[PDB]
Amino acid sequence: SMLKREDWYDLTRTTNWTPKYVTENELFPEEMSGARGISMEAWEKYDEPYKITYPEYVSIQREKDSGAYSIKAALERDGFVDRADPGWVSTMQLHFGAIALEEYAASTAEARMARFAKAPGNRNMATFGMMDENRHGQIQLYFPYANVKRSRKWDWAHKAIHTNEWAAIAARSFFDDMMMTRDSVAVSIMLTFAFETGFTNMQFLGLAADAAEAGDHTFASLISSIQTDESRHAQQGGPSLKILVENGKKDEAQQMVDVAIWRSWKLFSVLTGPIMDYYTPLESRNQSFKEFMLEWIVAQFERQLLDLGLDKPWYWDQFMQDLDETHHGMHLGVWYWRPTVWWDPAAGVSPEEREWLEEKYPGWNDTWGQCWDVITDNLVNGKPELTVPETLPTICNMCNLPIAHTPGNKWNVKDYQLEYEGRLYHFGSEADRWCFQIDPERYKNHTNLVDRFLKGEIQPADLAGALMYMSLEPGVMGDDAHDYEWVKAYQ
């Protein structure tokens, strides 16, 4: 007979001991552990709600991969990717380039907690997390690899995070700050609670639904499989936050959650927002990005924070407002600067789409629609050259994204500048500037793509030189997803 898990589970996390031959501070260096003066004894109160043991892990995860790899092999010769909507193809190319190597780097962020957390339940759950992100980084390479012969853009599943392309820099900026350069306890909070529990758990459910709706059962099966792994490790920050709050550290905990949720939001506004509102074909749009955010993200955050004894971040109301705006700017920026990305952005501004946008966002046509009006006229009137740029946008020094906001009849674009030790910094929002000011030594001497351009680091110092610096050449440089097919509706 076998024991019941509950009868022996605790012995798997009865693993703390009092060091003698080295000191506790030596064994758990504060810059790595982040124990914050809270004793080993008080960290041992850490109790993860979802429990799993090694034998269960290997058995369940063996079946997951049997399934997902089976689906892939069955559907491979069907060549769906060749007849998929090109906004769908672009959604996948963006997904893989932005995420595959950051999934893999997340296994290091899990390894940080596995070695350095004082809570023994955290160290074991992080060992399972480290395994999970290993899976994710690998399967999100194996899957796009199938397509390398279709387009060099699929090479960017591996290449992207090795480049200075601006979206890559913006992705490393986010991940390196949230998960790679923080102590174990901060990683548990910023990565697993704010980003994974807070955003990607529901994002992936949505994305698998969109994939299935697009007719892409390989990618739907991939994403849905990865998603089932998330909560096993995303659970780790909730317990850490409880211990910080119960001990003397609620403000420290509040501040980490505030920073992490804002930075996550900014990444989401460029990587997810445009996809939902513009790349997904109109007849497949279940709800708007704003609607998705309110139903599946924002409410859940308030619930989590309440239950933990924390407050809504100071910027919450502003954040709610920005659901009407920010991603429309990130979309227009990415489409306008399309040769600077490795996928083809879908303009998404046909008459039919524009009336959808107007319902989902009253005011769209007379703000966003204004810029799109001009763009559309130029394409109708044979001046495509005025639909691509001849300069760089201003980049935020926190999130490494263009500073953009409401245009047209309610113009409201602002720069939250800051002069600090003789340098002038630019910020796309009040929250972005604040993330800098609460910890300036963490960001001070970083330079964004614009900073580098202005400093002489991009040579030839012209647009062509900037493209080469970003590793982009014809064949991967983006262009309109539907090859301007939507222009025919306007003549």
Partner 1 sequence: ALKPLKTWSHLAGNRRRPSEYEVVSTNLHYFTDNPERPWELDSNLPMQTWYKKYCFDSPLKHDDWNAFRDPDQLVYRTYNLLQDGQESYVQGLFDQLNDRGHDQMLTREWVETLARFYTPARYLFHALQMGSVYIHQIAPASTITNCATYETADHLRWLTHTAYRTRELANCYPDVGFGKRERDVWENDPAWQGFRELIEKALIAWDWGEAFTAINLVTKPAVEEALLQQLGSLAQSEGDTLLGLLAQAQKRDAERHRRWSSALVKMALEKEGNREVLQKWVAKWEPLADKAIEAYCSALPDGENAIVEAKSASRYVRQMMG
Partner 2 sequence: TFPIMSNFERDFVIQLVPVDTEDTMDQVAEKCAYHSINRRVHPQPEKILRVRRHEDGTLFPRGMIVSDAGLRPTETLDIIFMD
**Binding site residues, a second copy, CB under 8 A:** 63, 66-67, 70-71, 73-75, 77-78, 212, 217, 220-221
**Which of 42, 44, 158, 371 touches partner 1 (CB under 8 A)?**
158
Return the residues of window 318-377 that contact partner 2 according to CB under 8 A: 328-329, 332-333, 336, 368, 370-371, 373-375
283 binds partner 1 (CB under 8 A): no
Owner of token pair 């030790």: 421
Candidate residues 44, 47, 176, 291; the one interacting with partner 1 per rule CB under 8 A: 176
- Cβ(262)–Cβ(313) below 8 Å: yes
The single-letter DSSP state of residue 396 is P
Is 467 a residue that touches partner 1 (CB under 8 A)? no
Among 152, 217, 242, 452, binds partner 1 (CB under 8 A): 152
Query: Taking the C-alpha atoms of 154, 160, 165 and 167 in order, what is their torsion angle to the nearest 10 degrees?
Result: 90
CA distance 444 to 9: 46
**Helix residue ranges, H only, 184-298:** 184-187, 201-213, 217-234, 237-246, 250-271, 273-274, 289-293
- Minimum CB distance to a second copy, residue 75 (Å): 6
In degrees rounded to 5, what are phi and psi of residue 420? Answer: -145, 120
The residue (of 71 and 178) whose beta carbon lies closer to a second copy is: 71
Beta-carbon neighbour count of residue 277 at 10 Å? 23
Q: Of residues 35, 130, 207, 379, which one binds partner 1 by CB under 8 A?
A: 130
**Amino acid at site 145:** Y
Partner that binds at residue 136, options partner 2, a second copy, Fe ion, none, CB closer than 5 to 8 Å by kind: Fe ion
Is 167 a residue that touches partner 1 (CB under 8 A)?
no
* 4 vs 6: CA distance, rounded Å: 5
Q: Which residues are annotated as a binding site?
A: 103, 133, 136, 196, 230, 233
| Whole-Å CA distances, 241 to 14, 144, 194, 280, 324 | 21, 37, 11, 37, 31
| Residue 111 interface partner, choices a second copy, partner 1, Fe ion, none, CB cut-off 5-8 Å depending on type | partner 1
Which residue has 């898990």 as its token pair? 5
Which residues belong to the annotated binding site for Fe(3+)?
Answer: 103, 133, 136, 196, 230, 233
Q: Does 66 bind partner 2 (CB under 8 A)?
A: no
What's the token pair of residue 382?
A: 């044979």
- Kindly tell me which of 65 and 155 has the beta carbon lying closer to a second copy: 65
One-letter amino acid identity for 407? P
Interface residues for partner 1 in 39-58 (CB under 8 A)? 53-55, 58
Largest CA distance in the chain: 80
Candidate ranges 40-48, 73-81, 146-154, 407-415; the one touching partner 1 (CB under 8 A): 146-154
Residue 14 or 321: the one with the smaller Cβ distance to partner 1 is: 14
Residue 74: contacted member of partner 1, a second copy, Fe ion, none (CB under 5 to 8 Å, by partner type) = a second copy
CB atoms within 10 A of CB 411: 10
- Residues in 445-484 at the binding interface with partner 2, rule: CB under 8 A: 450, 453-454
Among candidate residues 32, 42, 51, the one with its CA nearest the CA of residue 240: 42
Q: Binding to partner 1 by residue 242, rule CB under 8 A?
A: no
Nearest to 369 by CA among 396, 404, 401, 407: 407
CB distance 214 to 84 below 8 Å: yes
Residue type (1 letter), 431: A
Applying CB under 8 A, does 167 fall inside the site for partner 2? no
Q: Which does 155 bind (CB under 5 to 8 A by kind): a second copy, partner 1, Fe ion, none?
A: partner 1
What is the phi/psi pair of residue 141, to 5°?
-105, -45
What Å distances lie between residue 37 and 113, 255, 376, CA to CA? 17, 17, 60
Residue 111 interacts with partner 1 (CB under 8 A): yes or no: yes
Residues between 379 and 438 that touch partner 2 (CB under 8 A): 386-387, 389-394, 402-409, 411, 413-415, 417, 419, 424, 426
Instruction: Give the shortest CB-234-to-a second copy separation in angstroms.
Output: 24
Q: Which residues bind partner 2 (CB under 8 A)?
A: 328-329, 332-333, 336, 368, 370-371, 373-375, 378, 386-387, 389-394, 402-409, 411, 413-415, 417, 419, 424, 426, 450, 453-454
Give the footprint of Fe ion on this chain (CB under 5 A). Answer: 103, 133, 136, 196
